[PDB]
């Protein structure tokens, strides 16, 4: 059997880009913040609870799905580009609308730990793991009005936890499903367009 549960993080953060001109590509840093996660998706055909007497195997993969474009409040498109993905595995690069970053750091790990191996959507748990930052840069359209900007950029980040009854178990949430997961995180990108 295989049980996979996606635990979604949902913090809001700000990044000050300062004064910028439309010929520049201001950057912003997206950091992974340990916190409370909410199940937003699962797929299970195994047992619901492990009572401590039985073994199962863990495969954990961190995910970040980030938009390639975002509209400003006043109606202008900002183009998001990856500047430094750190150790993240940037995949499904052909998608026109979103970046997909994954970090599979645990696999084939046998455990007897008691717990709920298929929490339902809405359930929560605390994620204490830390992952690398991702630095993005933004291209501003030349026709962007001058002034202060506070751009809300929704995105998904979370932990895919896969429990299985056997060794060598592998599962990755399909990109097409991931792209649709609730985007509970928010980067609030601030900057003042002084021209150019
Ligand atoms: C679908 C698939 O399995 N392979 C694709 C691959 O998928 C892996 C990728 O998304 C990474 C990103 O971190 O996470 C998963 O794998 C983890 C580790 O990162 C990876 O190093 C490790 O590999 C070990 C393998 O499992 C062992 O059997 C082997 O003996 O030793 C290897 C190295 O130590 O595996 C884990 C698995 O959880 C994903 O599985 O991504 C690429 C890039 O897109 C491509 O699609 C592959 O087909």
From Swiss-Prot:
One of its GO terms (biological process) is cell adhesion. Disulfide bonds join 44-118. GO terms for molecular function: carbohydrate binding. The keyword Isomerase does not apply. Transmembrane segments: none annotated. D-galactose binds at residues 59, 104-107. The keyword Disulfide bond applies. Keywords: Disulfide bond, Fimbrium, Secreted, Signal. It is found in: Secreted; Fimbrium. GO terms for cellular component: extracellular region; pilus. Strains of E.coli that cause infection of the human urinary tract produce pap-pili (P pili) which are hair-like appendages consisting of about 1000 helically arranged subunits of the protein PapA. These pili mediate binding to digalactoside-containing glycolipids present on the epithelial cells which line the urinary tract. Belongs to the adhesin PapG family. Tip adhesin component of type P pili that plays a critical role in kidney infection through targeted interaction with the globoseries glycolipids containing the Gal-alpha(1-4)-Gal disaccharide present on uroepithelial cells. In turn, transcriptionally regulates host gene expression in kidney cells, leading to inflammatory pathway activation and renal tissue damage. Acts thereby as key determinant of invasive uropathogenic E.coli (UPEC), which cause pyelonephritis and urinary-source bacteremia. This is Fimbrial adhesin PapGII.
């Amino acid at each position: 059997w295989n049980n996979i549960v996606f635990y979604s993080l949902g913090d809001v953060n700000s990044y000050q880009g300062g004064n910028v001109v439309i010929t520049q590509r201001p950057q912003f840093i997206t950091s992974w913040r340990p916190g409370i996660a909410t199940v937003t998706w699962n797929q299970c055909n195994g047992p619901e609870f492990a009572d401590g007497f039985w073994a199962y195997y863990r495969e954990y993969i961190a995910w970040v799905v980030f938009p390639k474009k975002v509209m400003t409040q006043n109606g202008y498109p900002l183009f998001i580009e990856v500047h430094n993905k750190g150790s993240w595995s940037e995949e499904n690069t052909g998608d026109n609308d979103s970046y997909f970053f994954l970090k599979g750091y645990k696999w084939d790990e046998r455990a007897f730990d008691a717990g709920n191996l298929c929490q339902k959507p809405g359930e929560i748990t605390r994620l204490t793991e830390k992952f690398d930052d991702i630095i993005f840069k933004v291209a501003l359209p030349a026709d962007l009005p001058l002034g202060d900007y506070s751009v809300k950029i929704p995105y998904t980040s979370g932990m895919q936890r896969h429990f299985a009854s056997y060794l060598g178990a592998r599962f990755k949430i399909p990109y097409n499903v991931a792209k649709t997961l609730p985007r509970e995180n928010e980067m609030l990108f601030l900057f003042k367009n002084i021209g150019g």
